[PDB]
Amino acid sequence: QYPIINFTTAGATVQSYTNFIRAVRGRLTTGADVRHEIPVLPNRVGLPINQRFILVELSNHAELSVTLALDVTNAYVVGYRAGNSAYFFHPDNQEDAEAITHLFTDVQNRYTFAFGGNYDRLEQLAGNLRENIELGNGPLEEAISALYYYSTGGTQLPTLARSFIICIQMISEAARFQYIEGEMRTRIRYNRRSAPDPSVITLENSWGRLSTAIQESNQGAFASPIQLQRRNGSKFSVYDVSILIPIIALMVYRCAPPP
């Protein structure tokens, strides 16, 4: 009953990846709140649970398929299905736990992780930092096999964690930022994998702050600048929503929009 977007990594191109991410955004929004030309995700409060999630079915060159569940309120992966098993990140508010019981209700085996989905938990689990984990079509292809074979006991947990990190960044963060989508399109266009540079990681770390600064801004103007980093790690200050318009595609809801 939840909407499904399909994507295959095998023979993926800039175009098929672009179409996939646009379709993902399309399902996450309307939610027709746009603040400064930037769509805001639905406020979870008052959100009917039938509208809470979307499903992203990934398949790969090995003909393996896993379906991820994304929370439409933050674009984030809450868990996934592989065959007859479903796995969920440990929630952290009883409304979440409530919400996820409506996911993958037909599956035989449903497990909840001890851990949550945040990069901090995941990075230690993987024994690697985001900056040391390659992204690209290759890593995503492998991530899909890893996620699938976990449902059968053939995947070590640190490989799993690494797989979540790859997926979350190439789907959730890409839906959130045209800039990160751009970074992944480029890796795909040249079939090169590489770890995310500091510009990517700082965007990811600052998504909440960015959303708040934009929705609280005075006519687009930030009362206080936000520091981001360039590709080479040198820092720069954002003072205004204008420069973020071609960077950020979705925002998490923060308060009502002022009339």
Ligand X SMILES: O=C(O)[C@H]1O[C@@H](Oc2cc3oc(-c4ccccc4)cc(=O)c3c(O)c2O)[C@H](O)[C@@H](O)[C@@H]1O
Return binding residues for a carbohydrate: 4-6, 11, 46, 137-142, 191-193
Active site annotation includes 17? no
Strand order across the 4-8 sheet: 4-8, 53-59, 65-71, 76-82, 85-88, 109-112
User: Which of 110, 254 has the CB closer to ligand X?
Assistant: 254
Min separation Cβ 149 and ligand X, Å: 36
Min separation Cβ 254 and ligand X, Å: 4
User: Which of 112, 212 has the CB closer to ligand X?
Assistant: 212
Binding residues for AMP: 76-77, 117-119
Query: By CB under 6 A, is residue 216 in contact with ligand X?
Result: yes
DSSP 49: G
Strand segments, DSSP code E, in the chain are 4-8, 33-35, 38-40, 53-59, 65-71, 76-82, 85-88, 109-112, 221-229, 235-240
Dig out the tokens for 118 from the structure: 């945040």
Dig out the tokens for 230 from the structure: 């360039």
Active site annotation includes 123? no
Residues 196-215 that bind ligand X (CB under 6 A): 209, 212
The catalytic position among 176, 181, 204, 253 is 176
Question: Which residue in this structure is represented by tokens 């398929």?
Answer: 65
Active site annotation includes 209? no
User: Which of 114, 255 has the CB closer to ligand X?
Assistant: 255
Min separation Cβ 215 and ligand X, Å: 7
Active site annotation includes 190? no
End-to-end CA distance of the chain: 35
Min separation Cβ 187 and ligand X, Å: 31
Dihedral pair phi/psi, residue 110, rounded to 5°: -120, 120
Q: Which residues of this chain interact with ligand X, rule CB under 6 A?
A: 209, 212, 216, 254-255
Instruction: Cite the active site residues.
Output: 76, 119, 173, 176
